[PDB]
Amino acid sequence: MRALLPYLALYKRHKWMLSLGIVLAIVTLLASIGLLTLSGWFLSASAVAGVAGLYSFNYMLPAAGVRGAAITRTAGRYFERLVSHDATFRVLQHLRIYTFSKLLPLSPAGLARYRQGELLNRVVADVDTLDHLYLRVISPLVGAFVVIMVVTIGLSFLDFTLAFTLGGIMLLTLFLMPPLFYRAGKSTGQNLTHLRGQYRQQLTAWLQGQAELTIFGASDRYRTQLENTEIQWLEAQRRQSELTALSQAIMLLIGALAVILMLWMASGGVGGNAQPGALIALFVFCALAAFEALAPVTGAFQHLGQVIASAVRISDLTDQKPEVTFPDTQTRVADRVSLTLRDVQFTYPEQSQQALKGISLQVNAGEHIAILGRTGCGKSTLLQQLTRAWDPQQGEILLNDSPIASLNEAALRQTISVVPQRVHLFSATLRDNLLLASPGSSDEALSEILRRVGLEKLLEDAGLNSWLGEGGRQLSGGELRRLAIARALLHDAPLVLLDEPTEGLDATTESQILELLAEMMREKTVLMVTHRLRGLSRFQQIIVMDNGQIIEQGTHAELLARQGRYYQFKQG
Amino acid sequence: RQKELTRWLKQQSVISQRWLNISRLLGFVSGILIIAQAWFMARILQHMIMENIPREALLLPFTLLVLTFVLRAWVVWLRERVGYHAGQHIRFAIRRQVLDRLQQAGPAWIQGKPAGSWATLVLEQIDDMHDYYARYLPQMALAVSVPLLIVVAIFPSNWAAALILLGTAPLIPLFMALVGMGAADANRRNFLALARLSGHFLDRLRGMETLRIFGRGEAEIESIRSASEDFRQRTMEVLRLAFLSSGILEFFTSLSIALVAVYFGFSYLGELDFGHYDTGVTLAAGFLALILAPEFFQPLRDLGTFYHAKAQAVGAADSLKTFMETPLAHPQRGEAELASTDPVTIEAEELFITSPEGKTLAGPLNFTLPAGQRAVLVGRSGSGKSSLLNALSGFLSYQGSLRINGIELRDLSPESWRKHLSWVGQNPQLPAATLRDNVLLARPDASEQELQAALDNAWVSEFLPLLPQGVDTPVQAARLSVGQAQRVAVARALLNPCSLLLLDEPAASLDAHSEQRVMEALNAASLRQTTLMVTHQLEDLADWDVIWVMQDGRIIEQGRYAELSVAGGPFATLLAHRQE
Ligand code: HEB
Ligand SMILES: Nc1ncnc2c1ncn2[C@@H]1O[C@H](COP(=O)(O)OP(=O)(O)NP(=O)(O)O)[C@@H](O)[C@H]1O
């Protein structure tokens, strides 16, 4: 329960409404106990009085409590569900922002080891299970504590050796059972999230390699392997449901032990009088109705083990040290940046392959550059070095005759605008997908840039407010590439380095943007990286690299005239 | 059609009907024991309150009361283990049904979605339906047994008390169903706006690098703040009414304990006398109604707490029903088997090989490849070249007659045919534990000498020492470069002799060193058996016995390279490749 410390400090921001949602969970749980205890005594008090003493018996005060203890049992429950769900939703906001803030400096490098689709579905699932802490673990356990105390202090007035037994039995089952079952299920919980991940990798391997597995005959013996991890996985689940069933047979036997004891012990005498009279049904109906407060406690040993596991998975993810750090020094962003490389080497962490070995190049101001190479040659990795996603081992990068490690983080984003290979379409509006680049751009200027990229079709039917993204209006692959270039125009950086534009297009539209790149970014040092050769005559100093090293470079004619690698794979 | 989902879910229930009948049965035995432990308490309490009998005298009813609490605990333990066993029997049976569907559809349909997205449909969309069968559905059958048993056990004692509980029986569903109105006024206008805000956090996580590039990281936090806050106050218009349905149930369980207390409490006082059967109102007849009034509404209150069990299993069943119902074109299979391990001859005419959805992929085509002859297949991007290789592998269903060594393919048994077929593929996958099990995928029991020759022939040993753990290195663990993941996928293709070899694209997406290294091992490996290799580079194709050209799924060319090149008809050799 040490893992929860960074996240129990986010609750403290909303401590004064979390407690209100808890107090209502105590007033409601006290009306339920009070209504059944008062009614139980009232039947026994009146029946003992009988017909003979009906006039002396006052049936107007208890009948005023019942009218009151029933209007707080239903108004409290309605407000305990709102005020508690309201508090859970407000804590979620502080958890979404906290997770995003810590996962932001680690975005390219701290998450490269995992699977981005698989990881980011785990992180969203984890932040959801931290909300369960208040509703499933804290409110059921804190609320069940002060309910026991007040129904022990309250019944302490009538007698003490009795009210202590309810206090005793109900508090040990509150303090001893949640630990003794969390501890018992600790072994399977770690053995159940291991077999779930194991079954997920074996299923992904089976489904992906569905073409290779069938042909070589192995599609059957990797299904049996997959179906045998499931069998073990479904015994870890069973050993975990046989432990939720056991924690329900204990709270029902413990609840029996309290009722049987107050049926026996309260028979001897309640307080002074040896015969208790109606008070023997006040104790028994309190013992019977008090274990309503501890019904949520039965299942809170499981919902705690999930939050502990989730707080570990997300404190691990967000406590990684960033692979790059930016100086605090201020600087003035300057146009016409002349980028240079001097023998930068790079090896991805936990790996032996050198993904980028001994690459060096020179890009003067205004000098468009094209980098060409096969798939998996490390061209996009060279472009991660320039945006400071990683740091090159034993290398040196200079941006306008000064090291790029000396630029302020905010200033660096101003002097380098990139067009990512995987263009991302945020779910927000079109205006919010273009103000992404420049936040203060006017609505009119934002329209004409999107007009000049040749994406006029998006300006129809109130396009600037249309909801494109995951919700609807999904852009095609062809016109999603035109959107990224639109952002790189709003941002207006002196150096605009592109990563495989004109990829996945057709011949007629890829010549549109590739002309657009050299039409408006004439004053920019482009440094385009593509594996598709087209219209490279406008680019000077074409650079060809294979396997993380520049094979040969020069102007378009020079590699074509000279017998070289570029000339070789140009034709044929 | 949210009702049709629930209809489907209940349809799936029949798998473990023997287990959901014990849970239904034990919801009756656990309803009798609740009545027994209430009658015994009422009979014990009356004696010590009215007759002042000492506790040690009425020792027998205590023993039956203790024995009733032990039995009731045992049944609640029991019907939780039966309930789970019901749940993990539908899940174990749907998952097998889903996996069988995926295996039959073949690789052609699996590649329609990322393999991280077929795992949600199997790992999470299946596990989500557990709480609907383990907990919610047995509890739905406990919410009609115990309430009826409670009333039926009170009616002999006092029909007025049995009418206070049953009086709220029609008034509870009426008001909750009146709150159903308000779930069509708050979950209807907010259905859209509240669906653009569920994936608002994930979509900003998926694009952090895009946010980091433009430096908008600290200004998209305010967009999480302004979309999470709006999601809160959008979804309380729903919850300011959907919690009334909870308030109604908690109100009527308070009015039902109030009325039973007020009616009984006055009945002993003699103020009102209408309930009992003119036999006096014993105290036990009153305790038996206070002990059972919370129990009457207890299963229905717990059924409220199983909302999220129902909430998950309706979202999960949404995507599962569509998948299970889509029409698919699984390849037609037979039991014919050919025992000629020698190179086969493929013949085809009018092959309209068809994708799983039913759309035609490659149009009419006619060709013939004699045994021992290797035939490059070249064409423009998407011209039916890659599909023609799947069709010979069995992943696609064809229309016309195709013959393999004088026998048709559709009636050829895939398990026996694919023992004579070896292929590489484009974007090859290594679906095994290590780099040693991937090479030995054809025969896992291969000797070290045979494995060592395969690694050397495909030149896997060049990059082998510079790997961490050697030949047993796991492959997340050690991301082999594509130049090396294509050389282990080619040491596996030619590990064992075959009859037909199909190299989809061996030299593409490869570095300069492995290009001349793989092909050096795949020009020797293409002589031994018929090989239908597919490439886009014709620089060195003269040695190849035949060359085919496909455009828009139609084959248009034959003959060797020498006679075709000088032919100057539909020849793409003069066109410089654009994806190089
Ligand atoms: C729809 C929307 C919604 C949502 C979103 C939600 C979200 C949520 N939730 Fe909820 N709920 C609901 C709606 C809802 N909900 C309802 C309606 C109910 C009813 C129930 C009663 O009545 O009470 C509940 C109920 C409930 C409960 C109670 C039950 C028991 O006790 O077991 C709980 C605990 C919860 C938790 C929760 C959580 C944690 C969350 C996350 C944060 N929830
Ligand atoms: N995130 C990563 N973690 C570990 N190894 C990686 C990672 N990315 C790439 N590699 C390895 O190093 C190479 C880097 O490839 P990369 O330079 O990103 O490709 P590219 O030249 O951009 N071509 P493409 O994959 O088509 O976009 C890969 O082929 C792997 O061998």
Ligand SMILES: Nc1ncnc2c1ncn2[C@@H]1O[C@H](COP(=O)(O)OP(=O)(O)NP(=O)(O)O)[C@@H](O)[C@H]1O
């Ligand atoms: N599930 C599918 N399987 C095969 N083809 C599909 C599928 N869905 C759509 N298609 C289309 O089928 C047509 C045939 O493409 P295909 O012949 O497989 O291309 P290819 O030879 O793989 N091209 P390339 O890989 O660039 O050499 C194309 O229009 C595909 O986009």
Ligand SMILES: [Mg+2]
């Ligand atoms: Mg790339």
Ligand SMILES: [Mg+2]
């Ligand atoms: Mg292909």
